[PDB]
């Protein structure tokens, strides 16, 4: 089982510079090339570099040119790419995948990725909205806006309602986030049972409980 | 670099049925010493990173099903599954293994049909908290629905409202194949003071007129 | 031995 994993992925200021490794087991690394193929949120997949199963060959796009480097130690098993001249386009999932030297048929082996933000935004911590609606069910919401970075976890009374409940996914404003959700209950369940949204920001230590009045 | 077209980007299939997908090449990926053509299929499902499906056009990985086939040649190539199941609704690539810049496609996304189902759409006045805060956004879900064409619309005081809105959608429920959208429109508590009702309006394939939702501040 | 990629 060959087994490639990532690292090194952060949040970094547009310009500044990472570099990612990619620990392989269970192949002889010597004797493969290696490659980092790059996702964008699109959810486009992208060529980023390969490297010779011995270091001497290496070969780019017009657009990683002069700002990374492939990098390899087969003495340790591990790939590398330094990466310099950050921008903003180039945010990503960036994924290891081995290069076929016998067979030279398609990228067969991936590792798990490692997600890397380029973005000079400031920790910023949500704004918890209740959304009180103005028969059968009653539609309640909750706006989660303002905020850096990803991820923000938002439960409807800590994970005990958890059906018919709506988490959009998030939108990138002027370098800030903006995400809500709907739930449906019913009408004998509000008011006579309280809804409340649950927000944590990791990131800002943040964790707000919204109880949704009429 | 050969540019890959994949159309179409989103297929609705119904489990059982045949249903192919095609990719094309800008120049030949053919490559003559190994003697194969160089195309590779890839899917992918999310959280996932690819996995092979098939390789030099036609020959398929070690474990993927037989109802999935590779067929074509030069720069014109297709991928065919048999009898779709739900276990392939994923995005499939095809990528270009012949010459650097690697290119891969823009994906073919398989979506599951279900019947038409309208919107069950809602409107929401600004919390307090905000008006507080100097701002004031109005939200309104549109749960619920399939097909995934919807159109959304705001309307202060009647006319039609364009800078402010944004909108999430949501992929195909796993539970029941459907879409849901949000649509908020934000202001100032000033241009909110300044009027009186707000429209939330859809049109949608199930209805001939819009669902209008709203309300007077 | 290092070999160039098929690719290249």
Known sequence: ?214 | ?217 | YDVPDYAS
């Open chain 1, 1 to 214: 089982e060959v087994q490639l994993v990532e690292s090194g992925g952060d949040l970094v200021k547009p310009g500044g510079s990472l570099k990612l490794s990619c620990a392989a087991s269970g192949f002889s690394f010597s004797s493969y090339g290696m490659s980092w193929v790059r996702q964008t949120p699109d959810k486009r997949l992208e060529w980023v570099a390969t490297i010779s199963n011995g270091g001497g060959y290496t070969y780019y796009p017009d657009s990683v040119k002069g700002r990374f480097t492939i990098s390899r130690d087969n003495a340790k098993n591990t790939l590398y790419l330094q990466m310099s001249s950050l921008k903003s386009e180039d945010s990503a999932m960036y994924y290891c995948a081995r290069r076929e030297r016998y067979d030279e048929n398609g990228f067969a082996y991936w590792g798990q990725g490692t997600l890397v933000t380029v973005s000079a935004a400031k920790t910023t911590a949500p704004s918890v909205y209740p959304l009180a609606p103005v028969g059968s069910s009653v539609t309640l919401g909750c706006l989660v806006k303002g905020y850096f970075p990803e991820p923000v976890t938002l439960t409807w009374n800590s994970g005990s309602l958890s059906s018919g409940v709506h988490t959009f996914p998030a939108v990138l404003q002027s370098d800030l986030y903006t995400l809500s959700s709907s739930v449906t209950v019913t009408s004998s369940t509000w008011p006579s049972q309280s809804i409340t949204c649950n927000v944590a920001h990791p990131a800002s230590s943040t964790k707000v409980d919204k109880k949704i009045e009429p």
């Open chain 2, 1 to 217: 670099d050969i540019v890959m077209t994949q159309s179409p980007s989103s297929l609705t299939v119904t489990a059982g049925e045949k249903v192919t997908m095609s990719c094309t090449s800008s120049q030949s990926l053919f490559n003559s010493g190994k003697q194969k053509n160089y195309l590779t299929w890839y899917q992918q499902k999310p959280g996932q990173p690819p996995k092979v499906l098939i390789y030099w056009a036609s020959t398929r990985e070690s474990g993927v099903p037989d109802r999935f086939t590779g067929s074509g040649s030069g720069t014109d190539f297709t991928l065919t599954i048999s009898s779709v199941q739900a276990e392939d609704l994923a995005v499939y690539y095809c990528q270009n293994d012949y010459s650097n810049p690697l290119t891969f496609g823009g994906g073919t996304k398989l979506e599951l049909k279900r019947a038409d189902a309208a919107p069950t759409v809602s409107i929401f006045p600004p919390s307090s908290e905000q008006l507080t805060s100097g701002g004031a956004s109005v939200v309104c879900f549109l749960n619920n629905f399939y097909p995934k064409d919807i159109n959304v619309k705001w309307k202060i005081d009647g006319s039609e409202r364009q800078n402010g809105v944004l909108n999430s959608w949501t992929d195909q429920d796993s539970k029941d194949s459907t879409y849901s959208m949000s649509s908020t429109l934000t202001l100032t508590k000033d241009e909110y003071e300044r009027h009186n009702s707000y429209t939330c309006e859809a049109t949608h394939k199930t209805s001939t007129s819009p669902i209008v939702k709203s309300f007077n501040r």
